[PDB]
Each structure stands twice: as structure tokens, then as C-alpha cells.
Amino acid sequence: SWQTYVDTNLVGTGAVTQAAIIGHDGNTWATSAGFAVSPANGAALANAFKDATAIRSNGFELAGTRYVTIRADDRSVYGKKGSAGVITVKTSKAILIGVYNEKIQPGTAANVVEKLADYLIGQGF
């Protein structure tokens, strides 16, 4: 279920190259093959949705790579690193995380992730 959201609705689409779904405490509910985000980074991200102050000054880390905050509101937090980047979105019970590489259109990745979030939110999650 969470694994199929990640494997099918996120990675399987082609819009993100790697993806994870985290709880509001930052611990991973499911993750794409060989992609791993630390409970430490996850929590920080989780906090960002509440208070972006910290991430706005230093950005945020996810699976080794460091990112720069492009967007930060109470629902979405997006980072970028050259042609790459990460789209993260917050639902009622989790936070979706999707990274895309050079080959992907940033807004293509944002559409997929935000589309998954709307779905989950309408399912009570």
C-alpha cells in the first residue's frame, strides 16, 4: 500500500527518480529501492512545514544530498540542486518525498507528488 504508492504512483510514473513517504515524526513508512532518508533529516523536514525559518537559512538534507529551499509553505517544501531537486508535500498523516534528476521537468515532478498528496488527503491520510 504505502509501498505501492511509492513504487507505482511516484516512481513508476517516471516523474521522480526516487521517493519516500514519511510520518510527521520523520520515520519512513515506505521507500523506493535503495533510497533512504534518515529519521533525523525527516523530522527536520517535518518541522519545516511548521517553521520554515531553519530551512530558509540553511536549506535541508535528504539522503546525503543537500538542498536549497525554493518553496516553503504549510503544505509544500521544495528544494533544488542544479538540474535536480526534491518535491515534498505534507498530508494529514505523512509527508511525501520525490526527487527528480536532470532528465526531469521540475514541475512534472511537482504535479505527480502534489497529485498523490491530494489523493491521500481525501482518504483521511
Curated annotation (Swiss-Prot):
Site annotation Actin binding: residues: 115
Protein origin, superkingdom: Eukaryota
In-chain residues carrying the UniProt-annotated modification N6,N6,N6-trimethyllysine: 103
Localization annotation: Cytoplasm, Cytoskeleton
Listed Gene3D superfamilies: Dynein light chain 2a, cytoplasmic (3.30.450.30)
InterPro entries, sorted: PFN, PFN_euk, PFN_sf, Profilin_CS
Any Gene Ontology CC annotation: cell cortex
Keywords: Actin-binding, Cytoplasm, Cytoskeleton, Methylation
Entry keyword ATP-binding: no
Modification type Blocked amino end (Ser): residues: 1
GO-annotated molecular function: actin monomer binding
A Pfam family recorded for this sequence: Profilin
SMART domains assigned to the protein according to its UniProt record, in alphabetical order: PROF
Keyword Cytoplasm appears in the UniProt entry: yes
Quaternary assembly: Occurs in many kinds of cells as a complex with monomeric actin in a 1:1 ratio.
Family: Belongs to the profilin family.
Stated role: Binds to actin and affects the structure of the cytoskeleton. At high concentrations, profilin prevents the polymerization of actin, whereas it enhances it at low concentrations. By binding to PIP2, it inhibits the formation of IP3 and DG.
Protein name: Profilin-2
